[PDB]
A paper describes a structure:
Upon termination, the replisome is disassembled in two steps: first, CMG is ubiquitylated on its [name] subunit by a cullin-RING E3 ubiquitin ligase (SCFDia2 in budding yeast, CUL2LRR1 in metazoa); second, ubiquitylated [name] is unfolded by the Cdc48 ATPase (also known as p97 in higher eukaryotes), leading to disassembly of the replisome. Despite being driven by evolutionarily diverse E3 ubiquitin ligases in different eukaryotes (SCFDia2 in budding yeast, CUL2LRR1 in metazoa), replisome disassembly is governed by a common regulatory principle, in which ubiquitylation of CMG is suppressed before replication termination, to prevent replication fork collapse. Our structures show that the leucine-rich repeat domains of Dia2 and [name] are structurally distinct, but bind to a common site on CMG, including the [name] and [name] zinc-finger domains. The LRR–MCM interaction is essential for replisome disassembly and, crucially, is occluded by the excluded DNA strand at replication forks, establishing the structural basis for the suppression of CMG ubiquitylation before termination.
Ubiquitylation of CMG in metazoa is driven by CUL2LRR1 ([name]–[name]–[name]–[name]–[name]). [name] is positioned across the MCM N-tier, in close proximity to the parental DNA duplex. In addition, an elongated arm of lower-resolution density, into which thecrystal structure of [name]–[name]–[name]–[name] could be unambiguously docked, projects from the MCM N-tier in an analogous manner to yeast Cdc53–Hrt1. The majority of [name] was well resolved in our cryo-EM map, which enabled de novo modelling of an N-terminal pleckstrin homology domain and a C-terminal LRR domain, which are connected by a flexible linker that stretches perpendicularly across the parental dsDNA. The LRR domain comprises seven canonical and two irregular LRR motifs and forms a shallow arc, reaching from the parental dsDNA to the N-tier face of [name] and [name]. The BC and [name] boxes, which link [name] to [name]–[name]–[name]–[name], are situated between LRR repeats 8 and 9, and a two-stranded antiparallel β-sheet caps the LRR domain at its C-terminal end. In addition, the C-terminal HMG box of [name] could be docked into a small region of density alongside [name] and [name], which was absent in 3D classes that lacked [name], indicating that [name] interacts with CUL2LRR1 in the human replisome. Remarkably, despite the very different architectures of the [name] and Dia2 LRR domains, they bind to the same region of the MCM N-tier, but do so via completely different modes of interaction. The [name] LRR domain interacts predominantly with the three-stranded antiparallel β-sheet of the ZnF domain of [name], which extends the shallow arc of the [name] β-sheet. Finally, charged residues immediately preceding the β-strands of [name] repeats 4–7 form multiple polar contacts with the tip of the ZnF domain of [name].
Residue numbers in the entry:
A (entry chain 2): 518 to 689, 710 to 775
B (entry chain E): 1 to 176
C (entry chain F): 2 to 47, 58 to 205
D (entry chain 5): 21 to 274, 285 to 303, 312 to 652
E (entry chain 3): 2 to 271, 281 to 533, 552 to 555, 561 to 656
């Protein structure tokens, strides 16, 4: 799970739409446009026979795919708390109107958010300017901060890249990328025909890292580290 | 009395073997046996026959009653009669188990023999169940069980006798 | 052969066995009585216990105090041996729960007969007919429940009937082990657990 | 033609010889006629059914097994008739009152690997199939006619003992009067009617089999399959049971044109897992007898979780439960233990809930966010088949006799949270809605997981960390406030444990020393629950009384010193909670009485909850 | 449909046996006497005891229970012969004389769960609770038609699958003579019988673990057509039958099963010397009854006294001007968690007659009052009574009363104020009787009672609703160590108790049909606390005493009412739970009447008035 927090006009939404375009089984949703019920699962009278029936929400429909949540901080707390079970336990348990069952929601959540006031503050830590709480912050394996600080040489290079992009895409780092068709084929082959297996990972290194990362997190208060960061290490290696 | 002890008494029954060894007459306390001549029949107790078969020293012959037609006739007679019919041996079930488990190679149609003896056993156990139920229901003080075998009695007799002891005391508790 | 066997119950006979744990436990069960004479100092247990007072006390104590002319006390039957419950037993003996109503139903009922109640004949016939009614189901379940959970079969049986049930189970298991050839092996005794 | 009857006769004879001749064992040990013996014992017990193994039948005669697989409906009735014959010749003679021979239900089981519900495709119609699933619904048991007789209204011409085909298929009454001449009137259009007194009927039941949760394709809802059960398969399962069904895939035979509704006629049920074999039984006696059974159980609770030993011990007490009681005046006292885990994230609360739901003999997991008052306790709704209001059980009803694992317990609405007060304390659900007025049973433990009001406990805040009411909090026997402690050696050991845990996933799942497998501990909990109800000993009760009074005085003085009410109250329900915990500890050991040691351990566990209060 | 042929030889043998049983003259004459009373009371159903039939003829009893229909028609024909022998004039008044059955039926005692298809055609005794009744509708059994053209009368008699007859019968209503003339029905000369369907449901406490209660449909005819109403716990003896149906040339083998009842028994409320001795021997029998009321709950003496007053009830007054005063007493308990409010409510549910359980979140207004449902027999919409309607002349126990919605409490306003509920639904606008006492239990807002807030804001309910309750008790978990010691001693003693028929290690059994006779088989201080079984009968006899108010007690009540008004004046706005009003005076009259009922005095004395004033003082003036 990934959280992109940061300033306006820093291509967070463009990243989310790219992941939507490239990935199979992508669900895109935004802020107030989502609900707890709509995200997870919903119960309705069946349209013709009128018995209560359970129905798939976004997280269930993305069960082996990606759920993309733009404007993540703009959601309601009641809507945002619905995704905890799907984020960690990878299930959605519903007990409503005689239905008592758990659905599979094994998706990857990629969220985009703004800090408080719409501008990240280096005077403060992430926990001090995000407005999210520890249970949801800890559920994101990768936690990115994107800033729009002034830097003239980088601004010049970025401007040249952007204007060149507008030239290249008219209707008519160094390393070179793959074509996107080839990348899609590569992705699905890598996901379905290949399965990594961990033999060893030099446990002392990661254990000591986690121990003093916990110490510094307790010192500064910047981010809770819990136990999930260890398992995030294993997941990222795989 | 245990089923193993009933088997111990069944083991005293005489069966015919064909030795592959030569041995003069042996004067056992329970009666002399032999001489043992290779290739000829000789009649010996079942424990000795089974031991010699296990030690590969003889070929066991089926008893005269271990024949499929004879056993079918006995089974049908048992199924038709209401009382226990006379059995071909007083330890026929034990004989069947011992001989067929240790000498099925020697005894042809052993599957048919085992199934027919099982049929006779089932019929006679059903008759014994009927006898016990009738005894308790009609409050008998005596029953006649002439053709039952020891294993057949011993299967149910401890339970039945205990029940009848309790029944007797219940029907005589007003005696003083 | 030389296994342990407890002293057998004598509760169905004219008197119970002195050394029988089953008879001791059976005679501990309480019996309703009325005091026909006052008992000094006994109000500490239930000052005197007054004359004509109703009590429920153990069967052993009632048998000790009772006499045929009722000087110390007079005895009432428990309700399960009175005419109301006798009729329920007469309806169908197989559906009643003699574990609740006992667990020593027959033994306790047999020992009630020594109080010279006018309905001793009815009690005796009731006990005998209850046993006759329940015999077939005890026999069938004991002799045909093999290598399974017998608790459902044993639940509603009184201690005498449960003893008979275990006897039938022993016979069944003995024959089945013989048939499967497991009776041949020499085994460490049940004390081998420690 | 009658050559078909000749084929039927020889096939029935071959089934009869299978049931007469099949044996298991070896000549070195001994032989037992498996199906003869089972027929005899079941008939004498009054059971009138047997279960045949497809592999045994195939070993005896593979053609019969192939015929049963391809054409189960045709050949199963021959097998059942042969079973009736063998039952007769195995049980004859019978006592009085048992002279009339009974029909035998032959059930089927196999060692073959099962198919999925989504494997059932049109190529397999009328074939014998084996599939797994979960029972999610079960109808009332009702009567299906197996034999009828029909009489003509004009001439009283009677057809006797008409064989009714099994399953959801019906029967067509003859269009015109049979075997007599076309007189005057020739026929009223339905000449026949079913005679009321001559019908022979058997029990039948309808169930819904849901696809297993791990069999569902990604993004799809689980599929449903209707099941027809018959005779002794009725009430053999309940909703919530995991089953492997053996049955005939078939169409009902009385959206689209040529559409036919399908179902499985169940021929055998294997509950995946009301009985313990004597070997399991005596092993459970041994396990209760050994002196450190409490520690062994606690180490068996969630073995993949590092630490949390007191929490695991309290969970063991919750799994075993106290003893339910009814007092002389008719009032009931709760036996189940309610436990709340409350605090920091990433502390394995959800993993403990997921373990307990799988380890408890009866267990359901639900999220607090995803639940409602009706869906938790019980719901009222109208049935499209008949316009009347019916009840449908919620989580509490489905978990009656076990545990409800309510994850995300702080997330549920307050109006939904007040629904479970009666079901938590009184263990009943009183409904008075739409004219139906009743009181259902909900005898189940609540194991709840929740976070702080501020995510982490944030120790300066104190009582402001809790938004739960004193009413709901007093209904929890133990309230484990769980705080993620940052200690360096603890973190190193925990990280090495987690890394080894992830590494060891490929190690073929080998057995382990000093703990109980989950499948065994589940059965052991069930055995102890059904067998043992302890009580307090007198001296133990005195100890508990005095300690309770001391704790009450301490709680009062703490609240007075604070000049504010604590969120966790110390009440008479907490006294009874200590009593229940002591009884659960004794029930682990199958002891009829709880000792001072059990009371001391119960007080030790409860004083963690009292630490959480003060 | 419905006609079946029987073997005449066995029919005559059975009829001979049953007539021998009924001709009881040489013996005690029990059934001679019972048939005499059947004639004398203008009855035509005899209730026979199968215990007596087993004593006289055991095999005939067994065949009766296992072959119900043929044996029952044989028995009814024997009964008609015997009643003709006693009184031949009376025997011709009725077409048929019926026999119902009582006693012990052995294994045929069942519940709706265990009542399987194996019991078809057997006599079964089903114990359960009534959940539905249909409307009583007539059923034609024998119709006479007059042919005006031919000037002759034909008479036809009918049957259906429900009504197996053992005589030739039709199922078509005629409209034409054999000469094709029209026929005119003679309704007065025709015979019709009442017919009703009810549903008996399994007792909820006896259901297995994960299961909802099961149901069986029961058909009641003749005198039995209104012998049970919804909410009654009943035992129905009858014949279990299936109804083979057909639908247009085809039949699904699924047949619905019904119990055709032959006897219906209530299981509630069912000599005077013990009660007379008690009331004369005891001093303040009210105190002994109140403290004996709920033994497993320590303390709460005044609340127990108030609940005893609720159980005994006041007296209902109707005045010459049509104004009305209720007799029912309403009690509200507001209190902290774990102060036994729910257990007191559960005690009243277990011991009072017609005590209906209810909870705030489990109920709705419709379920509280009445619902529209469709009669499955007919299809027409009609009313189905809710909880407070079922609780008429009884109690409704509302736990979690603060958790209830105001829209639901709107119904409770009308029920408490006027003893009725008015409805306008289905085809019917009607005024249903709901004359029930209310025993409500609630928590204060914020869960625990707050000492630093007024009682009228600790109590979350509005004063308009609070005016309805006669008494309002505040129950606080005072943490006094003395009370803690004695309470914990009592609680641990209760938790150490075990029942007599139960072994030391036994876990609590789940229920089953352990009642195996239609009447109780085993059948005043405890084994000097009063016994519960005696106290039920005592309260039953005391409820009907109807004592009159006396002048000196009236003067005392007037003096103390005015004094309580002055105390209300002097009380601060934090020192009262409720204001004092004319309804406080009415409460005093009701409580004094209940105390008089407890004494069985037939006159309200100063003794009663004193306790009434003390109880009202205790309830009203607290903080
Ligand atoms: N580094 C960049 N390279 C290229 N385009 C960029 C870059 N940063 C921003 N943009 C452009 O800026 C525009 C806005 O992108 P967008 O993704 O909507 O910003 P954002 O991260 O979503 N800010 P917000 O929506 O307020 O949270 C797009 O047209 C992007 O292409
Ligand atoms: N002590 C532990 N041992 C092993 N795994 C652990 C431990 N603590 C946490 N984890 C892991 O951390 C992850 C989160 O566990 P989880 O059960 O959700 O804890 P939680 O307290 O319920 N989190 P939350 O729902 O935010 O409160 C899982 O992958 C666990 O395996
Ligand atoms: N004074 C008491 N004596 C005996 N048992 C008591 C007493 N007070 C409480 N209990 C016990 O405490 C438990 C809870 O009682 P309960 O009936 O729920 O009180 P309550 O106030 O209605 N609970 P609540 O619904 O949260 O207000 C029961 O097992 C009672 O027996
Ligand atoms: Mg954006
Ligand atoms: Mg969690
Ligand atoms: Mg309550
Ligand atoms: Zn015809």
């Amino acid at each position: 799970n990934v959280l992109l927090c940061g300033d306006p006009g820093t291509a967070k939404s463009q990243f989310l739409k790219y992941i939507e375009k490239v990935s199979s089984r992508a669900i895109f949703t935004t802020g107030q446009g989502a609900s707890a019920v709509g995200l997870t699962a919903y119960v309705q009278r069946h349209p013709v026979s009128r018995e209560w029936t359970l129905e798939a929400g976004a997280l269930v429909l993305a069960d082996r795919g990606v759920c993309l949540i733009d404007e993540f901080d703009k959601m309601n707390d009641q809507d945002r708390t619905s995704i905890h079970e799907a984020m960690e336990q990878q299930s959605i348990s519903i007990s409503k109107a005689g239905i008592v069952t758990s659905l599979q929601a094994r998706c990857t959540v990629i969220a985009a958010a703004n800090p408080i006031g719409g501008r990240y503050d280096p005077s403060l830590t992430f926990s001090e300017n995000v407005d999210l709480t520890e249970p949801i912050i800890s559920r994101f394996d990768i936690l990115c901060v994107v800033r729009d600080t002034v830097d003239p040489v980088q601004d010049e290079m970025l401007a040249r890249f952007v204007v060149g992009s507008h030239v290249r895409h008219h209707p008519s780092y160094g390393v070179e990328p793959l074509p996107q068709e080839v990348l899609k084929k590569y992705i699905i082959y890598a996901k379905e025909r290949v399965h990594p297996k961990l033999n060893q990972m030099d446990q002392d290194k990661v254990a000591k890292m986690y121990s003093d990362l916990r110490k510094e997190s307790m010192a500064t208060g910047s981010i809770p580290i819990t136990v999930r960061h260890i398992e995030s290490m294993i997941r990222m290696a795989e | 009395m245990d089923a193993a002890e009933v088997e111990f008494l069944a083991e005293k029954e005489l069966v015919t073997i064909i030795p592959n060894f030569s041995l003069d007459k042996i004067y056992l306390i329970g009666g002399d046996l032999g001489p043992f001549n290779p290739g000829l029949p000789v009649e010996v107790p079942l424990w000795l026959a089974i031991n010699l078969k296990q030690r590969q020293k003889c070929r066991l012959l089926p008893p005269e009653w271990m024949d499929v037609e004879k056993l079918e006739k006995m089974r049908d007679h048992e199924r038709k009669e209401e009382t226990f019919t006379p059995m071909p041996s007083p330890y026929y079930m034990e004989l069947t188990k011992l001989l067929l488990n240790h000498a099925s190679d020697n005894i042809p149609k052993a599957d048919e023999i085992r199934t027919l003896v099982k049929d006779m056993w089932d019929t006679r156990i059903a008759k014994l169940r009927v006898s016990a139920d009738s005894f308790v229901r009609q409050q008998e003080a005596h029953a006649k069980l002439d053709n039952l075998t020891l294993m057949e009695i011993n299967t149910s007799g401890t339970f039945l006798t205990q029940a009848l002891n309790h029944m007797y005391k219940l029907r005589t508790n007003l005696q003083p | 052969s030389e296994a342990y066997f407890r002293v057998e119950s004598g509760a169905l006979g004219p008197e119970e066995n002195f050394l029988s744990l089953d008879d001791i436990l059976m005679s501990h069960e309480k019996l309703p009585v009325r005091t026909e004479t006052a008992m000094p100092r006994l109000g500490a247990f239930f000052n005197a216990v007054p004359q004509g007072s109703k009590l429920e006390l153990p069967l052993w104590l009632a048998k000790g105090l009772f006499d045929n002319k009722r000087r110390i006390l007079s005895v009432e039957l428990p309700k399960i041996y009175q005419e109301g419950w006798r009729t329920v037993f007469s309806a169908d003996p197989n559906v009643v729960d003699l574990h609740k109503m006992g667990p020593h139903f027959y033994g306790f009922g047999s020992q009630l007969l020594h109080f010279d109640s006018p309905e001793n004949a009815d009690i005796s016939q009731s006990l005998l007919q209850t046993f006759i009614g329940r015999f077939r189901r005890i026999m069938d379940s004991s002799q045909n429940a093999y290598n399974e959970d017998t608790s459902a079969l044993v639940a509603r049986l009184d201690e005498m009937e449960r003893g008979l049930f275990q006897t039938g189970q022993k016979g069944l298991n003995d024959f089945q082990c013989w048939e499967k050839g497991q009776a041949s092996q020499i085994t460490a005794s049940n004390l081998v657990q420690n | 033609a009658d050559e078909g009857q000749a084929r039927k006769s020889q096939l029935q004879r071959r089934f009869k010889e299978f049931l007469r001749q099949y044996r298991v064992g070896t000549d070195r040990t001994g032989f037992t006629f498996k199906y003869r013996d089972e027929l005899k014992r079941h008939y004498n017990l009054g059971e009138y059914w047997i279960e045949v193994e497809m592999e045994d039948l195939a070993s005896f005669d593979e053609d019969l097994a192939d015929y049963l697989y391809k054409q189960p409906a045709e050949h199963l009735q021959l097998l059942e008739e042969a079973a009736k014959e063998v039952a007769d010749e195995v049980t004859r003679p019978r006592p009085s009152g048992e002279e009339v021979l009974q029909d035998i239900q032959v059930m089927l089981k196999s060692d073959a690997s099962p198919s999925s519900i989504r494997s059932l495709k049109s190529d397999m119609m009328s074939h014998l199939v084996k599939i797994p699933g979960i029972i999610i619904a079960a109808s009332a048991v009702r009567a299906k006619a197996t034999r009828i007789s029909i009489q003509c209204r004009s001439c009283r011409n009677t057809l006797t003992n008409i064989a009714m085909r099994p399953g959801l298929e019906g029967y067509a009454l003859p269009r015109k009067c049979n075997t007599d001449q076309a007189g005057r009137p020739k026929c009223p259009l339905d000449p026949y009617f079913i005679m009321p007194d001559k019908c022979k009927c058997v029990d039948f039941q309808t169930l819904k089999l849901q696809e297993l949760p791990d069999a569902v394709p990604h993004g799809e809802m689980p599929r449903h399959m209707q099941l027809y059960c018959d005779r002794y398969l009725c009430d053999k399962v309940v909703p919530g049971n995991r089953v492997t069904i053996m049955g005939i895939y078939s169409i009902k035979k009385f959206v689209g044109v040529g559409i036919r509704s399908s179902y499985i006629r169940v021929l055998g049920i294997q509950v995946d897992t009301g009985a313990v074999s004597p070997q399991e039984e005596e092993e459970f006696r041994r396990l209760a007898a050994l002196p450190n059974v409490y520690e062994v159980i606690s180490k068996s609770i969630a073995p993949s979780i590092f630490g949390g030993t007191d929490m695991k011990k309290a969970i063991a007490c919750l799994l075993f439960g106290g003893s339910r009681k009814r007092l002389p005046d008719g009032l009931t006292r709760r036996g189940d233990i309610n436990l709340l885990m409350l605090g920091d994230p990433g502390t394995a609360k959800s993993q403990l809930l997921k373990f307990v739901e799988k380890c408890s003999p009866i267990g359901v997991y639900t999220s607090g966010k995803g639940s409602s008052a009706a869906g938790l306790t019980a719901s009222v709704m109208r049935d499209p088949s008949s316009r009347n209001f019916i009840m449908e059980g919620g989580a509490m009803v489905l978990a009656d006799g076990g545990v409800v694992c309510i994850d995300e317990f702080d997330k549920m609405r307050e109006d939904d949270r007040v629904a479970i007060h009666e079901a938590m304390e009184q263990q009943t659900i009183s409904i008075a809605k739409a004219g139906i007025t009743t009181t259902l049973n909900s005898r189940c433990s609540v194991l709840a997981a929740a976070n702080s009001v501020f995510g982490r406990w944030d120790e300066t805040k104190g009582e402001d960390n809790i938004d739960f009411m004193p009413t709901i909090l007093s209904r929890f026997d133990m309230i484990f406030i769980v705080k993620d402690e940052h200690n360096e050696e603890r973190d190193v050991m925990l990280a090495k444990h987690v890394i080894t845990l992830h590494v060891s996933a490929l190690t073929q799942t080998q057995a382990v020393e000093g703990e109980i497998d989950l499948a065994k501990l589940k059965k052991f909990i069930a055995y102890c629950r059904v067998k043992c109800g302890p009580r307090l000993s007198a001296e133990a009760a005195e100890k508990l009384k005095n300690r309770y009074i001391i704790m009450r005085s301490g709680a009062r003085q703490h609240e007075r010193d604070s000049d504010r009410r604590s969120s966790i109250p110390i009440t008479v329900r907490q006294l009874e909670a200590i009593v229940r915990i002591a009884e659960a500890l004794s029930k682990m050991k199958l002891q009829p009485f709880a000792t001072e040691a059990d009371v001391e351990e119960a007080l030790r566990l409860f004083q963690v909850s009292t630490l959480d209060a003060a | 449909a419905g006609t079946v042929v029987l073997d005449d030889v066995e029919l005559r043998e059975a009829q001979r046996d049953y007539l021998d049983f009924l001709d009881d003259e040489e013996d005690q004459g029990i059934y001679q006497s019972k048939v005499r009373e059947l004639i004398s009371d203008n009855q035509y159903r005899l209730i026979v005891n199968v215990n007596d039939l087993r004593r006289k003829n055991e095999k005939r009893a067994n065949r009766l229970l296992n072959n119900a229909f043929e044996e029952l028609v044989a028995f009814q024909r024997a009964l008609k012969d015997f009643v003709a022998s006693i009184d031949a004039t009376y025997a011709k008044q009725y077409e048929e004389f019926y026999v119902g059955l009582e006693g012990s039926f052995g294994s045929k005692h069942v519940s709706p769960r265990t009542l399987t298809s194996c019991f078809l055609s057997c006599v079964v005794c089903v114990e359960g609770i009534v959940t539905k009744c249909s409307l009583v509708r007539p059923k034609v059994v024998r119709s006479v038609h007059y042919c005006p053209a031919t000037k002759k009368t034909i008479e036809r008699r009918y049957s259906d699958l429900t009504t197996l007859v053992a005589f030739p019968s039709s199922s078509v209503y005629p409209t034409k003579d054999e000469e094709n003339n029209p026929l005119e029905t003679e309704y007065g000369l025709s015979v019709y019988k009442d017919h009703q369907t009810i549903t008996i449901q399994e007792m909820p406490e006896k259901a297995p673990a994960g299961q909802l209660p099961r149901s069986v449909d029961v058909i009641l005819d003749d005198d039995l057509v209104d012998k049970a109403k919804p909410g009654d716990r009943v035992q129905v003896v009858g014949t279990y039958r299936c109804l083979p149906g057909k639908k247009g040339g085809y039949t699904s083998g699924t047949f619905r099963t019904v119990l055709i009842a032959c006897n219906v028994k209530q299981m509630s409320k069912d000599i005077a010397k013990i009660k007379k001795f008690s009331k004369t021997r005891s001093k303040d029998i009210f105190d002994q009854l109140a403290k004996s009321l709920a033994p497993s709950i320590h303390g709460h003496d005044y609340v127990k006294k108030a609940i005893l007053c609720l159980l005994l009830g006041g007296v209902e007054r109707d005045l010459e001007n049509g104004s009305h005063i209720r007799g029912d007493i309403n009690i509200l308990l507001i209190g902290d968690p774990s102060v036994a409010k729910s257990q007191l409510l559960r005690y009243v549910l277990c011991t009072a007659p017609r005590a209906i359980p209810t909870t705030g979140r489990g109920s709705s207004g419709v379920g509280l009052t009445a619902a529209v449902t469709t009669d499955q027999e007919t299809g027409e919409r009609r009313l189905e009574a809710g909880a407070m309607v079922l609780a008429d002349r009884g109690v409704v126990c509302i736990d979690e009363f603060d958790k209830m919605s105001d829209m639901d409490r709107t119904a409770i306003h009308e029920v408490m104020e006027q003893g009725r509920v008015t409805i306008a639904k289905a085809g019917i606008h009607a005024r249903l009787n709901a004359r029930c006492s209310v025993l409500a239990a609630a928590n204060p807002v914020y869960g625990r009672y707050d000492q630093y807030k007024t009682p009228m804001e600790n109590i979350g309910l509005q004063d308009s609703l609070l005016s309805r309750f006669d008494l309002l008790f505040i129950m606080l978990d005072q943490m006094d160590p003395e009370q803690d010691r004695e309470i914990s001693d009592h609680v641990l003693r209760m938790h150490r108790y075990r029942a007599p028929g139960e072994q030391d290690g036994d876990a609590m059994p789940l229920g089953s049909a352990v009642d195996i006779l239609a009447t109780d088989d085993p059948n005043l201080h405890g084994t000097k606390m009063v016994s519960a079984a005696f106290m039920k009968k005592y309260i039953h006899v005391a409820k009907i005493i109807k004592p009159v108010l006396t002048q000196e007690s009236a003067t005392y009540i007037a003096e103390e009412y005015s004094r309580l008004r002055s105390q209300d004046s002097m009380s601060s706005d934090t020192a009262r739970t409720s204001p004092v009003t004319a309804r406080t005076l009415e409460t005093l009259i009701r409580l004094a009447t209940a105390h008089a009922k407890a004494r069985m005095s037939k006159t309200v004395d100063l003794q009663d008035a004193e306790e009434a004033v003390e109880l009202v003082q205790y309830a009203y003036f607290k903080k």
